[PDB]
Symmetry: D2
Subunit: 330 residues, 4 copies
C-alpha cells in the first residue's frame, strides 16, 4: 500500500478520511531534509508538504520512490521543480486555495499602513493617555488619505488581481507590472499597466509584491531598486520571502525613503523582532507568514491536496493531475 508522507506535518486528520484506504498517511514532522525517516525515504509514493521544509536538487534523489509531491499551498518555490521534472517526480500545488484570503490580508496591510491602526493599537497598549486633539495628531502623525494614491502591484497573478479588484473601491489607482502576462487583462479590469519595473517604482505610493519567486526575480527589491522608489512610499509584501531584500529595506526605513513597510513573509523563517537585519527598523509591521490562513482555507487546501494524491495514486502521472507545475517532467 502506497505510504503517502506529510513531510512537515503533525496533523493528518483531514487527509486521512479521504485517503483512508488508498494509502497509509503517515506524517514525518520535519524541519530539515535530514529529519525524515528511512521508512519514508525508501517507500513513500507521494509526499504532500507545506511551505517550511525545503527540498533541493540533491534531496529529491535522497528518496527511493517519490511519484508525486503535492504542495499544500499556492507556491512551489521551495521545491526544485527542475530536478523533480527529471527525477520522475511531478509537483502539484493548490493554487486557488487562499486567494480571497491573501488578498484580504494584503489589502488590510495597506490600510494598516495608511491609517496606522496597528501602530495606534500598539501605542495604546504601551499606555498613552492621548486626550487632547493636539495629542492625537502626535500619535497618528502620518496617517494619510487614501483616495488618489497610486498602488503599484508587481504581478497580476490570481492574488494580484484579487487586490486590484478590491483596492479600486478605496480610491486607489492601481498600476500593475509583470512581463509574463499576455497583452490583455490591463483592459478587462480597468487598471493601467506599466511595462518596466522602473516605471512601477517611480509612480507608485504603496508598491506591493504578488509575484512567485523564480530564479529570475530573487531579491527583486534590492538596494538598487529602492533608490528608484518614490520618496516615502509604503511597501507591502505578502508574496514570498527572498523577493524583497532585507538589509536594503532596513537601510531605507532607517533613513526615510520608505515611510513604512508591512512585510508578511520574511527571508528567514520564522521571523522575530530580536534577530536579523530588521532588528531596529522603525515603521515596520510583520505577521508570521499568516495571510493564507483561515478556518475554511485550511479545510479547503488540505482536502484539495489529499484529493490530488488520490488522483495521482490511481490515475496516470502526470497526465491525470489537475494542477501539475512541471510539464518539463521528462
Amino acid at each position: 500500500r502506497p505510504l503517502v508522507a506529510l513531510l512537515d506535518g503533525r496533523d493528518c486528520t483531514v487527509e486521512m478520511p479521504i485517503l483512508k484506504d488508498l494509502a497509509t498517511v503517515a506524517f514525518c514532522d520535519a524541519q530539515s531534509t535530514q529529519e525524515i525517516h528511512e521508512k519514508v525515504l525508501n517507500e513513500a509514493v507521494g509526499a504532500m508538504m507545506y511551505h517550511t521544509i525545503t527540498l533541493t536538487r540533491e534531496d529529491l534523489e535522497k528518496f527511493k520512490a517519490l511519484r508525486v509531491i503535492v504542495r499544500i499551498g499556492s507556491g512551489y518555490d521551495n521545491v526544485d521543480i527542475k530536478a523533480a521534472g527529471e527525477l520522475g517526480i511531478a509537483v502539484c500545488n493548490i493554487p486557488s486555495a487562499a486567494v480571497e484570503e491573501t488578498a484580504d490580508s494584503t489589502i488590510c496591510h495597506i490600510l494598516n499602513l495608511y491609517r496606522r491602526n496597528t501602530w495606534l493599537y500598539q501605542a495604546l497598549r504601551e499606555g498613552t493617555r492621548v486626550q487632547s486633539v493636539e495629542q492625537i495628531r502626535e500619535v497618528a502623525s502620518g496617517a494619510a488619505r487614501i483616495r488618489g494614491e497610486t498602488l503599484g502591484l508587481i504581478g497580476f497573478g490570481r492574488t494580484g488581481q484579487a487586490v486590484a479588484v478590491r483596492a479600486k473601491a478605496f480610491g486607489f489607482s492601481v498600476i500593475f507590472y509583470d512581463p509574463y502576462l499576455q497583452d490583455g487583462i490591463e483592459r478587462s479590469l480597468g487598471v493601467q499597466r506599466v511595462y518596466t519595473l522602473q516605471d512601477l517604482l517611480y509612480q507608485s505610493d504603496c508598491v506591493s509584491l504578488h509575484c512567485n519567486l523564480n530564479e529570475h526575480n530573487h531579491h527583486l527589491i534590492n538596494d538598487f531598486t529602492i533608490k528608484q522608489m518614490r520618496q516615502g512610499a509604503f511597501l507591502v509584501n505578502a508574496a514570498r520571502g527572498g523577493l524583497v531584500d532585507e538589509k536594503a529595506l532596513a537601510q531605507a526605513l532607517k533613513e526615510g525613503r520608505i515611510r513604512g513597510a508591512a512585510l508578511d513573509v520574511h527571508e528567514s523563517e520564522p521571523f522575530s523582532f530580536a534577530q536579523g537585519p530588521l532588528k531596529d527598523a522603525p515603521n515596520l509591521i510583520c505577521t508570521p507568514h499568516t495571510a493564507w490562513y483561515s478556518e475554511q482555507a485550511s479545510l479547503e487546501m488540505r482536502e484539495a491536496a489529499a484529493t490530488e494524491i488520490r488522483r495521482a495514486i490511481t490515475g496516470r502521472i502526470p497526465e491525470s493531475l489537475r494542477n501539475c507545475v512541471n510539464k518539463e517532467f521528462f
Copy 2:
C-alpha cells in the same frame, strides 16, 4: 473686532491666516469648561471646539456674547443643540471633512478582526517563534473567510454608505438599519435594508455602528441587544462612543458571545487600556478616537471651519451658515 475663541487646542495656525483680518482668533486650550478665560467667555462671539469639551445648557449659558459654535467634525452631540438654539447660538459643523477616512479606518477595523493582522503583529512583538505550520494555526486560530459574511451597518448616513461602497468588494453581503432615512436608497447602492435591530443583529456576522448619538440611541448595544446578536459576531464601533454598554460588552467578550470587537471610540476618553470597564477583556482592539485623522483630512476640516466663521462674522446668522445643524433658533 470680534473674538473667535478656539475652545480646546494650543494650535490655531491653520485658521489664523484665513481668519486674520475679519476677527482675532485666540485659542483657549480647555480640557473642560472650568478653564475658559473670562475674556474668551465674556467677549467671544464665535467659538470652535473639537470634540473633547462638552458644552451643556448649564455651560452654554455662561458665554454672554457667543453667537456661533462651529463644531470641527461630524459631531455636535457634545453640544446641546436645543439649549444652544434657545440662546440664539447657531451650531454648525463640518460633516464632509473625514468620510473617506472614517470609512477606510472602519474597513481596516473589520479586516483586523477577520484576519487578525494586529493580533499577529502583537504576538510577534511579544515574541513568538511561529515556525511549524501547526503553530501558525494556533497563533492565528480564529481568522475567518470574509466572502459570505453579512456586514450589518446600524446607520446609513455618509459614513455608513461609504463603508457599504467599499465592503461590497470583499464579498461582504451588506445589510443596514436606519429608521430616519426616507426609504428608497437601499435600491441605489444595492444593499438589503432591514427595519428593526431585532432583525439586523439577528443576521449579521459583523455589526458595525455608524449612527449619530442623539437622545434616542444611548446604549443602543446594551445588555439586552447583545443577547440578540449571533453566537459570535464581531462588533465595530467607529462612531460616537456612548452607543455600547461597556459594562455589558466586556461581559459578552469574557464569555465568548462576541468573537472580538474593535472599538474606535469609547465612553471615557482618554482610554488608558488598563483602566475602565473592559480592563480585562479578550479579543478587543481599540484605537484612540483616531479614524477621523489624516494629514489632509485634518486640514480640510480646519480650513472649512475657519471659512464657516468667516461666513458667520460677515453674514446673517443663521441664514448665512452653509450647514447649520440646529435651525430651531
Copy 3:
C-alpha cells in the same frame, strides 16, 4: 364605504384585493377633470393616479376633500402639492418603486448612444449589406470608446446615485451637480461634485438629467445652457419631460452641437415621431416614457399605492402616512 378612485388606470386589479375589505376601488380612466362624476368630486376620500393626468389648482378645488391622493410612480409634478396642501389633500408617491429599472434603462440609453446598438439594429431592419469591413466602419461611424468620458449627472437623488454606481465600472468618470443635497454625499460614493451648472456642462461628454421637475428648473437645458455644453456631448434625459427644451435641443441636433440625445420623456406625451419639435432631428433615441416598467416594478408600486391608501384610510392624515410629499398643511 369610502370610494378610492384610479383616476387614469383601467386595471384596478392589483389594488383591488388589498383594500376590498375597507374601500371600494373603482377606476375612471379619465384624461382630465372633464370626465369625473359629480359625487366622486367633493367626498371621494382617495384617488391614485399615474403620470398622465395633470391636476391643477383650478382642478383640486373641484374635490372638496380628497383626504389623500397617491401618485403611483416616483414623480409628483402632476399635482400642485402647494395647492393640495391648502385643500386638506395630502399627496403621496412611491419613490423606491423603480429606482433601479430607471437606472438600468438610463445606462442602456448611454450605451445605445455610445455603441450605437439601436442605430445599427435600425440600420439592419432598414436593409443594409454591411459585408466589407469598410462598410462596418461607415455604418457604425461615431461609436466611441467609453473609458475616460465624464458622464455628468444633473441631480444626485436616488436615480442619480443608482446610475453613478452602475457607470463607475464602465470607465466613466462621474461628475454630478446638485444644489439641494447636503455636503458629503459625493465623498461616500467617490464622485467629484461640481457646484454650478456651467461647471457641469463644460466638463461632460454625457449630461444625463435626473432631477425632479419643480418650479425652479422648468426648461433647465434651454438654448442658453446648450450653448455651454461641450462641443459634441450626448444628452440622456430620463427624468420628467418639461425639463429640457424641445426646440433648442432640436436646433442643437440639426446643427451639430449635440452628437446624439436619447430622450425617455418629452414635452408632450404621447410622443409621436412625426408630429413635434423633433420632427426631423437626426441622432435621437426615444422611448415612450418606459424606464419605470417591468414585470415587477409594476407589482411593487401598485401594491405600495394600495397599501398607502390603507395607511391613509385607517390612520390619521399625513402624520400616519409614509411617503407624504407635502407636509405643508398648517
Copy 4:
C-alpha cells in the same frame, strides 16, 4: 521590404506611414481569397487581414512567399493556424484592443433585452401612440428587473472577464464556464464558476457567449443544448459566429423557449433580415459585427497590427513577434 498586403481592405492609411520605410503596403479588397491576385498571391511577403476573407489549408498553400499573417482582430478562427505552421507561416493577432468595446456592446445587448430600449424605439419608430399607461405596459410587455438574474457567460477569457466586471454592478450574479482556464480565476473577481456546460445552462437567466471558435465549439448551441436552457432565458452572442445553430435558435424563438436573443455575429456574413435561417424569428436584435468598433479601438488595432509587422519583417521567425499564435510552427 517585400510587399505587405492588406487582403481585406481598401484603405491603408495608418498602416502605411508606419510601414513607409520598410515595405510598400497594398490592398486587395478580396471578399474571397480567389479574388486577390496572381502576383501578390505569389510573392508579397505576408499580410494583414480583417475578419472576412477566410484562408484555408488548400488556400494558404497558394501563397508562395508568405512570412507572416497579422489579423487585425481579436480572434484567428478564419486562418488554419494548425496548418499555417506546418506550412511555414507565422500567424499573429492584436489580442487586446476593443476589449473595452466588445464588453460595452455585450452589456448593451444585455440591457437592450432586459429593458427593450431598442424594441421600444422600433415600435415607436412605427407610430405606436401610447398615452394610457395600460398601453405603455403593453408596448414594453416583457421588460424585466435585472437585480437577481444570473448572467451566465460561456468562456471567462479576456472579454468574459471585462463583462463580469461591468455586470456585477447591475445586480447580475455572474457565473462562467471555462474548461481551459487554470482554476483560481473565479476567486480573484468573485464570480462563481461552474464546470460543465449543462451546469451553466440550467442556471442562467441570460447566457452570453465569449469563447474562441476553434474545433470543439462549433454549434456550442445546438438543438440539444437549447433544450437545456432555462424556460425563456435570453441569449447574447457577441463572439465569433458559428457558435449558435441558427436552425435551432430560429425554433427556440418561435416557441418561447428563449425570450430573446441579441446576436451580434452570424453564421453567414453579411447579415440581413430577409435572407437566412432566422428570417422570421421574433425578439431578435442583431448588429452587423460592430461590437468591436470605435473611433479609437479601430485606430489602435490597426496601428498595433502595422507595428507587429514591422517587428516581423525586421525581427525574425516567431521569436521576435509579440502576440504570435500557432505553437504548431515547425
